[PDB]
Amino acid sequence: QIDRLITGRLQSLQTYVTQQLIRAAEIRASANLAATKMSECVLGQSKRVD
Amino acid sequence: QIDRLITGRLQSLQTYVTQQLIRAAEIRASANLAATKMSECVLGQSKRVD
Amino acid sequence: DSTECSNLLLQYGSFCTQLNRALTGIAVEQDKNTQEVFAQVKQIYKTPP
Amino acid sequence: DSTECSNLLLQYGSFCTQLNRALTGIAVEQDKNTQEVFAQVKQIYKTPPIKDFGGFNFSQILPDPSKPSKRSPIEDLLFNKVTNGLTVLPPLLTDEMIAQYTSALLAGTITSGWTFGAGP
Amino acid sequence: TKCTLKSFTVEKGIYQTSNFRVQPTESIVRFPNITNLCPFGEVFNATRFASVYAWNRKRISNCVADYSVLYNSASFSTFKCYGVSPTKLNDLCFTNVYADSFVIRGDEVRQIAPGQTGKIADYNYKLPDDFTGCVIAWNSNNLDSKVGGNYNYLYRLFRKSNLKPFERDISTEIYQAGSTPCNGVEGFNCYFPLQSYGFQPTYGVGYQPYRVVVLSFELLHAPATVCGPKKSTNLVKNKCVNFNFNGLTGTGVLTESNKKFLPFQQFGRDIADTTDAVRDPQTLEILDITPCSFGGVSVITPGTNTSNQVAVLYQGVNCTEVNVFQTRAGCLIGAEHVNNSYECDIPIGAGICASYQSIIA
Amino acid sequence: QCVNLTTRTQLPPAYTNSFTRGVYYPDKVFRSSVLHSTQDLFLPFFSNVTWFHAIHKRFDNPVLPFNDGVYFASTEKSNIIRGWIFGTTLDSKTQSLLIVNNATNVVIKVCEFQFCNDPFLGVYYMESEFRVYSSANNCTFEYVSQPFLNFKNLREFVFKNIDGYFKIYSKHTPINLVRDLPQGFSALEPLVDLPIGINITRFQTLLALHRSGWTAGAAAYYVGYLQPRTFLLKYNENGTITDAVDCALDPLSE
């Protein structure tokens, strides 16, 4: 009975950690973009359109 | 017993391949950044701040 | 808090260590993200009164 | 080498094919990453033998002829400072050819400015 | 490649199709020296055997037992097992062995059996219904019998109740055949229970004395000290063989090792807890276990619209272990190596590329 | 034959520090230049070990509970400590294990012994006094082996009862310290595994008298208890354990 519960909860936790890693990669990309905007729009004047 | 070992080792291999794919996405983003820096800082003079 | 569950969970190896390591990496990555975005100056500038 | 294990593993289908294909995609992506970073020039440039650049010294970044690896002193220091069915595929570009690409980029940006990145 | 890609046309490129294996050639089983043998020579071939009412029990333990010599002996007229197999005695392991030795009549040899009812079974030597082990019996007319009659071998003839299994009774209490009171005084209906046999050389088969040794096995939670013999083969080095060293099995190339073990250590492990060093139990020498040269088989081809010529790359495999060329990526068979440098058409790896112009590398 | 020893001096037992002693090899596996974390019955670092004396008038031979394992440390000169007493009830009702080292050899027996209340050996100034048992009825295992043996010698022993296997680990160390346990590192090699298959819950050291009444030769020994914990063991290039980390001692070693 605990073997069934362990494999179910371990699959749930592995799914959660995989989704968190993908979302953390997305948030890291957004934060790298935000740091680029902080460097190029706030700390200087940008010729890049939009 | 071999089926238990097979599903455990298959879960381990799927976990390894999934985290390798996530790290490959991160390394691809870093390499795209490095190619951009190669084009814009080495092959030219960049007006982009920092 | 079930010790029989943890004794059975130790048979699966280092899955829990892998998940804790991934979550710790995400947790320090968030502080790295905030550090990269907002801490772009080492001088705290002040406006005139 | 257990044949009973492989006979039971055939019941799970093409999981092994998916894992191998994902790893193959990662493996060719690494070579593509190195190709996009370093192979940005199709002309292998060299510096002149006389290093008269108006007082500017590039000996720490130009390749050392005395070293057999043809690396710069900085690149040599960088390479010194980095230390069951499993196989490691070698990268398509060796470290000598990546160093040759960086040497060509350095020679182009020293002798020709940014003109080599936009044309001749 | 067409089988792997599930298509009848193959685009130009390199395709990993199979997995080269160095097949194991021999099986090497090395097991340590077969010493400290069990003392079966002092039980089966002793000087004087015991009587059946006082059968001698020898405890066989903390030794290795060679039952093949006992089973292959042709002197034994009866070899009947009731809980095990005679051909699997050298393979199984038991905690201890009880050896019960006695002499009986030739017609009573069948009476040492589970479920068998007789005078020897009820009053002299009883076996349980779940008996495990083997009963061994052989004729001893040339040794035990005497021309004046061998009266030294006694046997119990009368008792009030039947025996429990593996129970001795050396008591000499006078039996009561009738209901008259006997205080140990013999009378008309009170007889001594132990009678002597009539072993003489003029009797035929059935009245001759038979020496019987009965082996009984115990399978308790004590460790199995009594095991069968181990037939170790010769040791073969420098080949991808299946090694079996003291119960540790695997597949590898066994070469000489420069790792100096401490004398209490037997196996060797690397960082990743894989057995890469081992000690041979027969001769105390250290062997490195290199894994066999597994590799990926890749097929280098142009398009099937262009040509049907292919080249084969065995990844991380030396060319002596499989137009043959050795690369750092592996062994490439079917491509002619040239000294000219071109642009990369089909990537091999480590700076090697292949192209069609025949297939050149 | 049994003799009550009635000329003892009453004194409470002592305690001292274990330092980094009690480490043994957990397995028969060679390891080279690697750090190995293992979960086994280990002696805690810097632990409270019970200290017993034999000095003249002290003669410390009590019976102590075995628990899950025994670390025996011996600061020995002139070979006073000769063996140990192993069993549960230490009488003829149960089955007991005897380890003795007399003047010739070491004898290991698993039998039903009737132990004396005060068991000892004796040397006349020549060993001519054996009073450790009064009977031996039902033996199941006998094993004669090679001898294991200012304080000059240091003898460490680990005794474990796991699945009917009796593991003896030992190490001989040349020391020159007078009173206490020296501070250092020495991993105990596995000497002999015994197929005993018996229950053991209590133990007792065996000493030797010196006769010239009786006189106790100068000796001191230490008893430590093995607990299930984790060690991080360091294996050098030659494959000996040179250092260890107790994972439950302090947060730094954790």
Ligand SMILES: *[C@@H]1O[C@H](CO)[C@@H](O[C@@H]2O[C@H](CO)[C@@H](O)[C@H](O)[C@H]2NC(C)=O)[C@H](O)[C@H]1NC(C)=O
């Ligand atoms: C350029 O820089 C290099 C190194 O910074 C100079 O080489 C040094 O030259 C001095 C005197 O000639 C020697 O004492 C040093 O040992 C040299 N260092 C190395 C690392 O070689 C070099 O002189 C500079 N100028 C030119 C024109 O190359």
Ligand SMILES: *[C@@H]1O[C@H](CO)[C@@H](O[C@@H]2O[C@H](CO)[C@@H](O)[C@H](O)[C@H]2NC(C)=O)[C@H](O)[C@H]1NC(C)=O
């Ligand atoms: C040594 O002393 C012990 C402890 O007093 C003695 O053991 C007791 O002996 C008496 C003698 O009749 C018994 O009634 C007790 O039951 C014993 N106690 C235990 C715990 O066993 C021992 O006999 C003495 N030795 C000698 C040789 O007299």
Ligand SMILES: *[C@@H]1O[C@H](CO)[C@@H](O)[C@H](O)[C@H]1NC(C)=O
């Ligand atoms: C007597 O029996 C023993 C049984 O172990 C056997 O080894 C020995 O060879 C026998 N003796 C003869 C003379 O056959």
Ligand SMILES: *[C@@H]1O[C@H](CO)[C@@H](O)[C@H](O)[C@H]1NC(C)=O
């Ligand atoms: C075991 O048998 C081999 C066979 O030759 C022999 O060389 C060796 O000395 C024996 N003893 C040990 C302890 O290996």
Ligand SMILES: *[C@@H]1O[C@H](CO)[C@@H](O)[C@H](O)[C@H]1NC(C)=O
């Ligand atoms: C060891 O135990 C004794 C009594 O149990 C105690 O008095 C002593 O303080 C302890 N030692 C340490 C270092 O705690």
Ligand SMILES: *[C@@H]1O[C@H](CO)[C@@H](O)[C@H](O)[C@H]1NC(C)=O
């Ligand atoms: C030591 O003990 C063994 C076993 O009891 C015995 O055979 C031997 O004679 C003893 N040695 C001496 C010197 O008494």
Ligand SMILES: *[C@@H]1O[C@H](CO)[C@@H](O)[C@H](O)[C@H]1NC(C)=O
């Ligand atoms: C143990 O010994 C006693 C007396 O020596 C004896 O009566 C008893 O049968 C023996 N038990 C075993 C199992 O040997």
Ligand SMILES: *[C@@H]1O[C@H](CO)[C@@H](O)[C@H](O)[C@H]1NC(C)=O
């Ligand atoms: C071992 O002995 C102890 C104390 O005598 C007892 O509590 C325990 O149950 C015994 N174990 C077995 C398996 O007999």
Ligand SMILES: *[C@@H]1O[C@H](CO)[C@@H](O)[C@H](O)[C@H]1NC(C)=O
């Ligand atoms: C290992 O052994 C060699 C002798 O072969 C010795 O020179 C060296 O100092 C030893 N190293 C260690 C760390 O014990």
